[PDB]
């Protein structure tokens, strides 16, 4: 049941106070794309010299088992906070859906070391022990520990998303999601899968909604009830505006239809 019955325009509020505070202004990539308070990731154990050390522009997405953190690409001044998030939440898989720079605009500040290098990002130590190139993505095997605890964090960095619109077919996204799914399931009690793009809502929302629907089909089979608008509204209750364009909406149905056809 991956048929489109409703048009995107039918898809059409909760507090965002923390994101709005003056102390947090420079932690947002876009002035008006902010995390809801009720699902934001709250960062603990911050530097006690910092009056505000609990904020990152990120939300937990729980499909309503696997959960996600939807976030923006790092800014130079949020790279440390991003690694505090990944550590604290026990995340073991990161899905990066952008290049660092697209059409000459930054979309994410490099927050991982080169292959066979290590860097410390604030209190977090990150070692890149191996990269693997695939046609549609690079996988980086990262080892994360707290400088004062090591665990492997696998970063799947999608390569092939066009700088304009969406991929004209979903094969690359589905191969990538399938590897993500198996890696997450390979790691006992891994935490939420981190997904990001520039703002953390368009590409990030498209990937998370496709993964959620594909996971339903895993549990329930190809004839299960699917409701894409309801699933989008459900994720939108947890971070504002997820799935931004009509092309991304049509791409979601195309991807789930192709997934069904592999079964």
């Amino acid at each position: 049941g991956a048929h489109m019955w409703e048009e995107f325009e039918t898809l059409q509020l909760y507090s965002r106070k923390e994101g709005q505070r003056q102390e947090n202004k420079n932690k947002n990539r876009y002035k008006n794309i902010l995390p809801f308070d009720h699902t934001r990731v709250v960062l603990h154990d911050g530097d006690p010299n910092e009056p505000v050390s609990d904020y990152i522009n990120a939300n937990i997405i729980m499909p309503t088992k696997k959960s996600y953190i939807a976030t923006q690409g790092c800014l130079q001044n949020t790279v440390n906070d991003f690694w505090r998030m990944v550590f604290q939440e026990n995340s073991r898989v990161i899905v990066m859906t952008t290049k660092e720079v697209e059409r000459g605009k930054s979309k994410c500040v490099k927050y991982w070391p080169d292959e066979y290098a290590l860097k410390e990002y604030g209190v977090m130590r990150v070692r890149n022990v191996k990269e693997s190139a695939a046609h549609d993505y690079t996988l980086r095997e990262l080892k994360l520990s707290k400088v004062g605890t090591e665990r492997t964090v696998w970063q799947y960095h999608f390569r092939t998303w066009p700088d304009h619109g969406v991929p004209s077919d979903p094969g690359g996204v589905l191969d990538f999601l399938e590897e993500v799914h198996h890696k997450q399931e390979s790691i006992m009690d891994a935490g939420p899968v981190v997904v990001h793009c520039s703002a953390g809502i368009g590409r990030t929302g498209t990937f998370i909604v496709i993964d959620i629907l594909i996971d339903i089909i895993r549990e329930k089979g190809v004839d299960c009830d699917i409701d894409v608008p309801k699933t989008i509204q459900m994720v939108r209750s947890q971070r504002s505006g997820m799935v931004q364009t009509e092309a991304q909406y049509r791409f979601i149905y195309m991807a789930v239809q192709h997934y069904i056809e592999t079964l």
Side-chain angles (χ1 to χ4, degrees):
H3 183 71
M4 184 188 300
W5 295 86
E6 300 200 76
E7 299 303 325
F8 189 57
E9 245 35 73
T10 72
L11 301 171
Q12 273 132 32
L13 78 288
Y14 283 91
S15 156
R16 305 167 297 138
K17 288 172 238 281
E18 290 303 305
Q20 281 172 335
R21 290 172 68 164
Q22 185 81 355
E23 299 93 335
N24 294 329
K25 137 194 190 48
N26 54 295
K27 300 171 188 173
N28 304 134
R29 186 174 269 295
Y30 308 95
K31 211 194 323 205
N32 48 342
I33 294 173
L34 303 176
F36 290 137
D37 302 314
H38 72 288
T39 54
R40 75 173 186 99
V41 170
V42 181
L43 299 176
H44 305 302
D45 201 32
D47 178 353
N49 292 105
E50 283 306 329
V52 173
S53 63
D54 73 332
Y55 178 87
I56 180 164
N57 193 322
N59 300 267
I60 300 277
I61 308 304
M62 295 251 18
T64 226
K65 235 255 150 167
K66 182 195 232 153
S67 59
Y68 306 84
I69 289 163
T71 190
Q72 63 181 22
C74 291
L75 294 160
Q76 189 45 67
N77 60 307
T78 70
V79 164
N80 295 174
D81 293 341
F82 175 90
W83 281 113
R84 286 170 62 208
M85 178 175 70
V86 168
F87 193 87
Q88 170 194 295
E89 302 292 318
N90 191 224
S91 295
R92 310 300 185 84
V93 175
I94 296 166
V95 173
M96 176 165 182
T97 63
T98 65
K99 306 175 177 70
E100 292 171 44
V101 182
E102 294 185 355
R103 250 110 84 278
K105 303 291 197 188
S106 191
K107 299 307 182 185
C108 189
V109 172
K110 186 162 175 298
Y111 55 85
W112 64 93
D114 295 353
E115 188 178 30
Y116 310 130
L118 77 78
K119 277 189 67 82
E120 299 192 342
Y121 298 104
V123 302
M124 295 298 172
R125 172 178 264 233
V126 182
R127 186 192 304 260
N128 181 348
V129 308
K130 188 62 195 100
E131 296 189 2
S132 301
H135 182 256
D136 288 297
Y137 64 90
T138 294
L139 171 60
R140 306 198 173 90
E141 181 180 354
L142 309 175
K143 283 27 186 349
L144 169 64
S145 62
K146 181 173 209 160
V147 162
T149 62
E150 201 164 81
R151 85 280 311 276
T152 303
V153 178
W154 296 93
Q155 189 207 26
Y156 284 88
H157 180 179
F158 197 80
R159 184 206 309 315
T160 50
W161 202 276
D163 290 335
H164 51 317
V166 305
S168 61
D169 86 273
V173 167
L174 290 172
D175 285 341
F176 177 79
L177 281 179
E178 202 62 14
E179 285 300 308
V180 172
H181 153 77
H182 282 313
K183 181 66 65 182
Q184 174 74 4
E185 261 186 21
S186 80
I187 298 167
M188 186 190 80
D189 300 329
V193 179
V194 177
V195 187
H196 70 85
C197 58
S198 58
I201 60 174
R203 292 186 205 171
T204 288
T206 296
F207 275 77
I208 288 173
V209 173
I210 295 170
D211 198 64
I212 283 169
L213 298 168
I214 290 177
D215 280 357
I216 293 173
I217 295 153
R218 297 187 208 279
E219 192 84 1
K220 271 30 144 30
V222 63
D223 296 318
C224 70
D225 303 316
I226 295 296
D227 188 326
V228 167
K230 177 192 187 98
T231 298
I232 296 175
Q233 288 306 353
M234 174 274 298
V235 309
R236 281 189 179 190
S237 74
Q238 300 176 253
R239 184 169 169 87
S240 301
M242 298 294 272
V243 186
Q244 288 183 128
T245 69
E246 184 171 48
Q248 282 168 356
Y249 183 69
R250 290 178 212 116
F251 185 79
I252 290 165
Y253 285 95
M254 194 191 203
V256 179
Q257 291 158 350
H258 284 227
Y259 182 80
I260 285 166
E261 152 266 313
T262 73
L263 304 173

Coordinates of all heavy atoms in Angstrom, one line a residue, residues 136-172:
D136 N 27.2 5.2 -3.6 CA 26.3 6.2 -3.1 C 26.7 6.8 -1.8 O 26.1 7.9 -1.4 CB 24.8 5.6 -3.0 CG 24.2 5.4 -4.3 OD1 24.0 6.4 -5.0 OD2 24.0 4.2 -4.7
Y137 N 27.7 6.3 -1.1 CA 28.0 6.8 0.3 C 29.4 6.4 0.7 O 30.0 5.4 0.2 CB 27.0 6.2 1.3 CG 27.0 4.7 1.5 CD1 27.9 4.1 2.4 CD2 26.3 3.9 0.7 CE1 27.9 2.8 2.6 CE2 26.3 2.6 0.8 CZ 27.1 2.0 1.8 OH 27.2 0.6 2.0
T138 N 30.0 7.1 1.7 CA 31.2 6.7 2.4 C 30.9 6.3 3.8 O 30.0 7.0 4.4 CB 32.1 7.8 2.5 OG1 32.5 8.3 1.1 CG2 33.4 7.5 3.2
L139 N 31.4 5.1 4.3 CA 31.2 4.7 5.6 C 32.5 5.0 6.4 O 33.6 4.5 6.0 CB 30.9 3.2 5.7 CG 30.9 2.6 7.1 CD1 29.8 3.3 8.0 CD2 30.5 1.2 6.9
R140 N 32.4 5.7 7.5 CA 33.6 6.0 8.4 C 33.4 5.3 9.7 O 32.4 5.5 10.4 CB 33.7 7.5 8.5 CG 33.8 8.3 7.2 CD 34.3 9.7 7.4 NE 34.5 10.3 6.0 CZ 33.6 11.0 5.4 NH1 32.3 11.2 6.0 NH2 33.7 11.4 4.2
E141 N 34.4 4.5 10.0 CA 34.4 3.8 11.3 C 35.1 4.7 12.4 O 36.3 4.9 12.3 CB 35.1 2.4 11.2 CG 35.0 1.6 12.5 CD 35.7 0.2 12.3 OE1 36.1 -0.1 11.2 OE2 35.9 -0.5 13.3
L142 N 34.3 5.2 13.3 CA 34.9 6.2 14.2 C 34.9 5.6 15.6 O 34.1 4.7 15.9 CB 34.1 7.6 14.1 CG 33.8 8.2 12.7 CD1 32.9 9.4 12.9 CD2 35.2 8.5 12.1
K143 N 35.9 5.9 16.3 CA 35.9 5.4 17.7 C 35.8 6.6 18.6 O 36.7 7.6 18.5 CB 37.2 4.7 18.0 CG 37.4 3.3 17.5 CD 36.7 3.0 16.3 CE 36.9 1.4 16.0 NZ 38.0 0.9 16.8
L144 N 34.8 6.6 19.5 CA 34.5 7.8 20.3 C 34.7 7.5 21.8 O 34.3 6.4 22.2 CB 33.0 8.2 20.2 CG 32.5 9.2 21.2 CD1 33.1 10.6 21.0 CD2 31.0 9.3 20.8
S145 N 35.5 8.3 22.5 CA 35.6 8.1 24.0 C 35.7 9.5 24.6 O 35.9 10.5 24.0 CB 36.9 7.3 24.2 OG 38.1 8.0 23.8
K146 N 35.4 9.5 25.9 CA 35.5 10.7 26.8 C 36.9 10.8 27.3 O 37.3 9.9 28.1 CB 34.4 10.6 27.8 CG 34.3 11.8 28.8 CD 33.1 11.7 29.7 CE 32.6 13.0 30.2 NZ 31.1 13.0 30.6
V147 N 37.6 11.8 26.9 CA 39.0 12.2 27.4 C 39.3 12.0 28.9 O 40.4 11.6 29.3 CB 39.4 13.7 27.1 CG1 40.6 14.2 28.0 CG2 39.6 13.9 25.6
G148 N 38.3 12.2 29.8 CA 38.5 11.8 31.2 C 38.0 10.5 31.6 O 38.5 9.4 31.3
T149 N 35.6 4.3 28.1 CA 34.3 4.8 27.6 C 34.3 4.7 26.1 O 33.2 5.1 25.4 CB 34.2 6.3 27.9 OG1 35.2 7.0 27.2 CG2 34.2 6.7 29.4
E150 N 35.3 4.1 25.4 CA 35.3 4.0 23.9 C 34.1 3.1 23.4 O 33.7 2.1 23.9 CB 36.6 3.4 23.4 CG 36.8 3.8 21.9 CD 38.2 3.6 21.5 OE1 38.5 2.4 21.2 OE2 39.0 4.5 21.3
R151 N 33.6 3.6 22.2 CA 32.6 2.9 21.5 C 32.7 3.2 20.0 O 33.2 4.4 19.7 CB 31.2 3.2 22.0 CG 30.4 4.4 21.5 CD 30.9 5.7 22.2 NE 30.9 5.5 23.7 CZ 29.8 5.6 24.5 NH1 28.6 6.1 24.1 NH2 30.0 5.4 25.8
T152 N 32.4 2.3 19.2 CA 32.4 2.6 17.7 C 31.1 3.3 17.3 O 30.1 2.9 17.6 CB 32.6 1.3 17.0 OG1 33.8 0.7 17.5 CG2 32.8 1.6 15.4
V153 N 31.3 4.4 16.5 CA 30.2 5.1 15.9 C 30.5 5.1 14.4 O 31.5 5.5 13.9 CB 30.2 6.6 16.4 CG1 29.1 7.3 15.7 CG2 30.0 6.7 17.9
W154 N 29.4 4.6 13.7 CA 29.6 4.3 12.3 C 28.8 5.5 11.6 O 27.6 5.6 11.7 CB 28.9 3.0 11.9 CG 29.5 1.8 12.6 CD1 29.1 1.3 13.8 CD2 30.5 1.1 12.0 NE1 30.0 0.2 14.0 CE2 30.8 0.0 13.0 CE3 31.3 1.2 10.8 CZ2 31.8 -1.0 12.7 CZ3 32.3 0.2 10.6 CH2 32.5 -0.9 11.6
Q155 N 29.6 6.3 10.8 CA 29.0 7.5 10.0 C 28.9 7.1 8.6 O 29.8 6.7 7.9 CB 30.0 8.6 10.1 CG 29.3 9.9 9.6 CD 30.4 10.8 9.0 OE1 31.5 10.4 8.6 NE2 30.0 12.1 8.9
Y156 N 27.6 7.1 8.2 CA 27.2 6.8 6.8 C 26.9 8.1 6.1 O 25.9 8.8 6.5 CB 26.0 5.9 6.8 CG 26.2 4.4 7.1 CD1 26.1 4.0 8.4 CD2 26.4 3.5 6.2 CE1 26.4 2.7 8.8 CE2 26.7 2.2 6.5 CZ 26.6 1.8 7.8 OH 26.9 0.5 8.1
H157 N 27.8 8.4 5.1 CA 27.8 9.8 4.6 C 27.3 9.7 3.2 O 28.1 9.2 2.3 CB 29.2 10.4 4.7 CG 29.3 11.8 4.2 ND1 30.4 12.5 4.3 CD2 28.3 12.6 3.7 CE1 30.2 13.7 3.7 NE2 28.9 13.8 3.4
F158 N 26.1 10.1 3.0 CA 25.5 9.9 1.6 C 26.1 10.9 0.6 O 26.1 12.0 1.0 CB 23.9 10.1 1.7 CG 23.1 9.5 0.5 CD1 22.9 8.2 0.4 CD2 22.8 10.4 -0.5 CE1 22.2 7.7 -0.6 CE2 22.1 9.9 -1.6 CZ 21.8 8.5 -1.7
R159 N 26.4 10.4 -0.5 CA 27.3 11.0 -1.6 C 26.5 11.6 -2.7 O 26.9 12.7 -3.2 CB 28.3 10.0 -2.1 CG 29.4 10.4 -3.1 CD 30.1 9.3 -4.1 NE 30.6 8.1 -3.4 CZ 31.3 8.3 -2.3 NH1 31.5 9.5 -1.9 NH2 31.7 7.2 -1.6
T160 N 25.4 11.0 -3.0 CA 24.8 11.1 -4.4 C 23.6 12.1 -4.4 O 22.9 12.2 -5.4 CB 24.5 9.8 -5.0 OG1 23.8 8.9 -4.2 CG2 25.9 9.0 -5.5
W161 N 23.2 12.7 -3.2 CA 22.0 13.6 -3.3 C 22.2 14.8 -4.2 O 23.2 15.4 -4.0 CB 21.5 14.0 -1.9 CG 20.0 14.4 -1.8 CD1 19.5 15.7 -2.2 CD2 18.9 13.7 -1.3 NE1 18.2 15.7 -2.0 CE2 17.8 14.5 -1.5 CE3 18.7 12.4 -0.9 CZ2 16.5 14.1 -1.1 CZ3 17.4 12.0 -0.6 CH2 16.3 12.9 -0.7
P162 N 21.3 15.0 -5.2 CA 21.6 16.1 -6.1 C 21.6 17.5 -5.4 O 20.9 17.7 -4.4 CB 20.4 16.1 -7.1 CG 19.5 15.1 -6.5 CD 20.1 14.2 -5.5
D163 N 22.3 18.4 -6.0 CA 22.3 19.7 -5.4 C 21.0 20.4 -5.6 O 20.7 21.4 -4.9 CB 23.6 20.5 -5.8 CG 24.9 20.0 -5.4 OD1 25.0 19.2 -4.3 OD2 25.9 20.4 -6.0
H164 N 20.2 20.0 -6.6 CA 18.9 20.5 -7.0 C 17.8 19.3 -6.9 O 18.1 18.3 -7.4 CB 18.9 21.0 -8.4 CG 19.4 20.0 -9.4 ND1 20.5 19.3 -9.2 CD2 18.9 19.7 -10.7 CE1 20.7 18.5 -10.2 NE2 19.8 18.7 -11.1
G165 N 16.7 19.5 -6.1 CA 15.6 18.5 -6.1 C 16.0 17.2 -5.4 O 16.8 17.3 -4.4
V166 N 15.4 16.1 -5.8 CA 15.7 14.8 -5.1 C 16.2 13.8 -6.1 O 16.2 14.0 -7.3 CB 14.4 14.2 -4.4 CG1 13.7 15.3 -3.5 CG2 13.3 13.9 -5.6
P167 N 16.8 12.6 -5.6 CA 17.3 11.7 -6.6 C 16.1 11.2 -7.5 O 14.9 11.1 -7.1 CB 17.8 10.5 -5.7 CG 18.1 11.2 -4.4 CD 16.9 12.2 -4.2
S168 N 16.4 10.9 -8.8 CA 15.3 10.6 -9.7 C 14.9 9.1 -9.5 O 13.8 8.8 -9.9 CB 15.7 10.9 -11.1 OG 16.8 10.1 -11.4
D169 N 15.8 8.4 -8.8 CA 15.2 7.1 -8.3 C 15.8 6.8 -7.0 O 16.9 7.3 -6.6 CB 15.3 6.0 -9.3 CG 16.6 5.3 -9.3 OD1 17.4 5.9 -10.0 OD2 16.8 4.3 -8.5
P170 N 15.1 5.9 -6.3 CA 15.5 5.7 -4.9 C 16.5 4.6 -4.6 O 16.6 4.3 -3.4 CB 14.2 5.4 -4.2 CG 13.5 4.5 -5.3 CD 13.9 5.2 -6.6
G171 N 17.0 4.0 -5.6 CA 17.8 2.8 -5.3 C 19.0 3.1 -4.4 O 19.2 2.2 -3.5
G172 N 19.6 4.2 -4.6 CA 20.8 4.5 -3.8 C 20.4 4.7 -2.3 O 21.0 4.2 -1.4

